[PDB]
Amino acid sequence: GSTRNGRDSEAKRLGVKRFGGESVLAGSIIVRQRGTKFHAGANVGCGRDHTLFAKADGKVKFEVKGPKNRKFISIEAE
Amino acid sequence: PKIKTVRGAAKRFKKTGKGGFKHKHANLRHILTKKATKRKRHLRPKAMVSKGDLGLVIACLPYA
Amino acid sequence: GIREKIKLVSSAGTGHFYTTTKNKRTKPEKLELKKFDPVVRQHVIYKEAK
Amino acid sequence: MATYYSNDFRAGLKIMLDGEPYAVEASEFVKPGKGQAFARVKLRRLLTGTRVEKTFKSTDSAEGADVVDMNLTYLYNDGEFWHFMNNETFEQLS
RNA sequence: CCAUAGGUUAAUGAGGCGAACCGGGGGAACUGAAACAUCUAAGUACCCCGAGGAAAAGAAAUCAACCGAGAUUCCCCCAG
RNA sequence: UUUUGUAUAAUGGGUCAGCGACUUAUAUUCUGUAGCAAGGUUAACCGAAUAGGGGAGCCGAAGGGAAACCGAGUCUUAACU
RNA sequence: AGGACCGAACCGACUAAUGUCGAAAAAUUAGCGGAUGACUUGUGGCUGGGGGUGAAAGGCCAAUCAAACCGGGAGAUAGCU
RNA sequence: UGUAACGGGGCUAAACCAUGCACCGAAGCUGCGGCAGCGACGCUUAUGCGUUGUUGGGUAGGGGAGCGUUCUGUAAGCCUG
RNA sequence: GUUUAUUAAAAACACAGCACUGUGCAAACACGAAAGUGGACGUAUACGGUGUGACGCCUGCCCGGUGCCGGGAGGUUAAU
RNA sequence: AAUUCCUUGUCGGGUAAGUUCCGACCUGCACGAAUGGCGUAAUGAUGGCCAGGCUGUCUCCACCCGAGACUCAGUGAAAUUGAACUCGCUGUGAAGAUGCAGUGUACCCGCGGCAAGACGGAAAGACCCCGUAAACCUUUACUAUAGCUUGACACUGAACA
RNA sequence: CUUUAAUGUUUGAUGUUCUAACGUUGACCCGUAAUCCGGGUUGCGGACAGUGUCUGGUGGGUAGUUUGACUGGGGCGGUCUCCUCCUAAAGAGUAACGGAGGAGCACGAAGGUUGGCUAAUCCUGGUCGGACAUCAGGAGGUUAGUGCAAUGGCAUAAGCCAGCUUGACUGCGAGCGUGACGGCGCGAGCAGGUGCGAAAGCAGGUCAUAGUGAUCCGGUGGUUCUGAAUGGAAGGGCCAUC
Lengths: 78, 64, 50, 94
Description:
The structure is cut from a larger assembly and holds chains A, B, C and D. Chain B is built from 3 helices and 3 strands, in the order αββαβα. Chain B is α+β, with helices and mostly antiparallel strands.
């Protein structure tokens, strides 16, 4: 007979690129993600694609803050 | 007989001072108004031919 | 397709132009935007043309 | 551009070949073992419309027409012409 | 009617062969384009005519760059 | 030989002797090597001629730019941190 | 009289067997069809390659035919063996 | 097609499970002799070694080092009735 | 009667007849760059083409489509 | 039905029995009127069917006569061929074994026969797919072109309406 | 516009007459012993026909050619780029003619900013008024919304509303992300010029992720950058674009 599926897309290569304590030079993408699964914290910016880019050549560190426990991404400064 | 140059590659590449090649980027001839001006700034200057497709350029223009 | 493309021409002395789109058969009044003119280095009014 | 192949269109799909618009009334798509496919299409002329019968192959067929059949309101007569108005958008028509 | 046309007679010349080169008249397709039609192959193969020991071109209605060079042909560069 | 894999019942060869398949030309790039070295080398041609003349040229010492133009800088830009 | 009839020569080729490294690159044997005609035959002409000829089968054109043979382009091209 | 569902004879342990030591068994490992690559080294050298460390299956494929054949110079030399 | 010389002799091809159609003669048409020939030393009771296939009884409706024939008002349209 | 799928349609004839033949019906998948429809005497090396006569076609083969085959003398081929000291079997295996495993059987070597196997011989499968293969053929495929056809200029001028 | 007439009208459209080009495959005469040819007369055609060049039409009569790939053999049917989820084995990636759906846009506000606001659906009470309109209160909690499929996200709202607005701005861009490459994505900061806000600040489009096509050829605008003797120009180039 016939089929109606067989269609997908270029896998977007998302996820975290730089993990925990791992020195990142300013402007380095850390998390490439759909929505704000991981939120931007200290010294880390958020782009127009919810890519949290580093902003200060330092470390990383994820956390949980407020009263929603949203992994948060900060940048220890070394 | 001496090697003839591919004449179309002669008009699209130019040798730089350390063996590399410069080429004009390829998206900036038409439907431009749907492109953002961030793409229409980065496509405007000259690029360098990558390390992968550098051997294909050398073979098709030996004198330049 | 329907939303055709227009050409905002600068009201300064030069001929710099922005190009954009406009659905003409819903909102047919012309665009009178105020954009940056890089020849004058000022921020003069632009106006729709074809 | 809206090009059509003859194995595609069902009925009412307005096509445009040989300088005249055509409506398709019906089309029977057949293809037999050891032959190719053809569609014996029962068309309809649109400008002088009586009927026309074409038996297209599987390839090719025609461009479409700008062929809108919308509701118009007869409201006026003058000399020859007859003017009309849309009750949805109020565009002129002569 | 003159005259031409034709016929006659004499004189002189050509005719055919020949491997390549050489000038002219005509002139492919396979192929390559990773298909193909523009294009290429290629004015090539091939065909025909014509001469010579060589032949054709050859004494600027040529170039040049404002300074100049001085017919034509051929080899090496310019120059893939 | 070809293949994922052949004793294969897949190919090929009756045997013997002889012949039988990466060449040649000219450009081009890298490797070795020899010469000379910010220089290196001539092509036709001339030549009592694989000598010697001949430097016409060619590549290299400077790049940037589409180009004019500028020059250890240049382009981009109204200007570059 | 007759594209009349039966039937030898002459012309043909319906069936069967044999033959199918044959006696023969299509024949033999036993029967079979036409046999005064749109017949058959000898000699010599004529028509030619996308052309001839064809009571038409794409049959025939020197044991070759959906485009002969020979020579040349030519060592065409072969992503295949 | 023939026993044809231990490989077979045959087995009531020569079957199964447990536990125990023996032995067989490879081109593995060790022994003994030779060979080659590569890396270190010491002290030597135009490079070798009591050395020492290791390494050495191979198709497509890349790298290295050779043998032999015909012919040219060395060669009117040398070998040869 | 003819046919696939060399696996098919038939219901295929041909046929007398039939009808449509072209052709007024320097004919239509065929062969040929052209001259010229065939048609034909014929001339519409003649020739070419196409379909059908003795004879008997017959041959119905459809001009939308496609071809053909005729018409020229109008629209479109080449070189110039 | 030279046409009918279903289907060996259903009915009748013929036969002890008939998917064929003949008649008929009509539910004509999908006849049909000069790409002719339906009849048609004659004719056919034409297609189907039935009957008489006739028989080795057959039940079911028997015997005889000749030419080979067989032996002998003479001459003397061929396709074929990796090499062979070239068994059965059951299993394994590039999946159908003379060759491997287990096992059985078999003294060495001819001759006359028969062909089940050697995936026997002959023909680089014709079917099937594939090649950006080839040829012819078709047409409302694409692009051209001969021929036909239209008009303008040329050969080509003079008078009026 | 629509008729009428005068003139120079641009002229074509045809339609008789004529003979001298031209035709004659009409008779006669000569070359000439020749149903060829040539000339000479004469008759009939006659500026027609015919031919050359250019040109529109028709043109399988003829020639060169094309006629896709995947595919559980091939044809047929389906499919071919992009986005979302699963398969996908907790980094990324991952196939099948595997299981499901979507895109070939929309918007000058649906973008920017500042200021505020909080849903869905039931429940009761209430004029017409019902299962359901508007009003009021409660329960409820984001089961709502998000220009559009799915997933992730969203209360500081990215959801709803209002004012002012054009940053849907030009030149750059450290640094990474992701592709074999062409490319694609993110981006603090820098200069110029603006918007909104008292200000701190935010703003180089939109909640993110589809909404798309390389070159060549050519079109338009700008810029003396080149401009075949020179001066211009043409044509190229660059820039904006189609």
